[PDB]
Design a protein around this ligand. Structure first.
Ligand SMILES: CCCN1C(=O)c2ccc(Cl)cc2Nc2ncccc21
Ligand SMILES: CCCN1C(=O)c2ccc(Cl)cc2Nc2ncccc21
Lengths: 129, 130, 130, 129
């Protein structure tokens, strides 16, 4: 049939969808689930290269699926898998403890840690047919 | 067996692609032709809604296929078809006469007129396999 | 000859300073004492309004002078004075008992309770020369 | 008898004031003028060091007085003075032409170019008594 639905970008084995507006991590997490998708999950250097290129026209922040309760907990994706250490280093204030947890976002090709209640753009991803 | 090639966005009956770099209108037109495509052509409110949504995360200008020789000439797409007046209003300095004509671009949901020799990003469009 | 020293914010009858790094409550209390100052003490709605405004561009937590041994003990400032109940409500896990006591912090305009050994930024305050 | 008014930070020969929220460059410029002040003007490495330190607790963008009509025009401060050579490099999409001009902003210690209709925090600066 067709690899990706309308409005989505087909890349490799996945479909990517940029959000129309800025919402908190919980709102972005919910939006992806409603479209049978998860938030952005980076599994390879090729995935990171594609995402940095697709966000090269934006100076805005983009919420990914990586998050943790506090610095004593590990960085995990929505499905419960861990982050591959070689892919990228989470910069910024990683040692801070926020009441709604610490969520990871990508901005200008770099990944930074931040409070989950902040409004930011998002990228949803799902398997391509 | 598939509506659009890789890296393109499938919408309605067209495939849309954002340009890799900022070039003048003539070079932007050439780039689309090189990918078997034309510069962005907006025919409906549903096309403008989609484009504004696709460019919502960018503060950059994106060229489209609308252009004219000078203010005394009508705004026309690359194929020669005219602009539907209800779709949108072309803002900015529309009364200016540039040596390489006046080309239109979309930025932050709004359409503005500008000199065609200015470097700007672009959106290419081509028919989807349906 | 001047109300506050360099890098401090002058407000009302006090000088406020944001800490250079994130440390546990005891180290944050020590840092203020080294600058001839104490941890943030909120005595009025005007003081709270100022602090929320000064921290409006930060998503980080800031320690204050409010702390208690456990939930059975009252919330008290460093000098021993109590909290005015109308000023604000301490949110979060207030019913928890930590080995180094429970310390209060302000983040995004709201006041939350937390373990005193956690590294957090802080606001120091001292009297202004008037 | 006081170099800076209440709520301002005294640094060197100036007074600095952080904005309470985010507004477009024109509104930020208006706010500073209302307080007998101008948008942030960096004249030395010591001024840049102070600003980066004062914004170290924020991952948000902050507006500065540096702006230009388009890439063919020079980067100028509000008073008309040019940008000093070895202070900083303006990063990002400097080759773009926005309808409301290109205004410079500081974020995470780095200076980037951007569209002036975007809402951002701001820093006002005026001489100290
Ligand atoms: C979630 C916030 C996204 N955002 C920026 O990230 C942003 C980045 C740079 C500047 Cl100067 C100003 C900015 N503010 C802003 N204004 C309007 C639309 C989006 C933005
Ligand atoms: C001018 C916009 C300021 N801003 C950010 O710059 C910002 C930075 C990072 C993230 Cl993840 C999300 C962000 N959005 C945001 N949400 C709430 C208050 C402020 C912000």
């Amino acid at each position: 049939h067709m690899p990706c639905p309308q409005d989505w970008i087909w890349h490799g084995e996945n479909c990517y969808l940029f959000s129309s507006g800025s919402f908190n991590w919980e709102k972005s997490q919910e939006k992806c689930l409603s479209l049978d998708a998860k938030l952005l999950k980076i599994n390879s250097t090729a995935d990171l290269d594609f995402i940095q290129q697709a966000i090269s026209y934006s100076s805005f922040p983009f919420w990914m699926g990586l998050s943790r309760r506090n610095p004593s907990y590990p960085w995990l994706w929505e499905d419960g898998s861990p982050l591959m250490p070689h892919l990228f280093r989470v910069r910024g204030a990683v040692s801070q403890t926020y009441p709604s947890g610490t969520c990871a976002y990508i901005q200008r090709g770099a990944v930074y840690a931040e409070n989950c209640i902040l409004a930011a753009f998002s990228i949803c991803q799902k398997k391509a047919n």
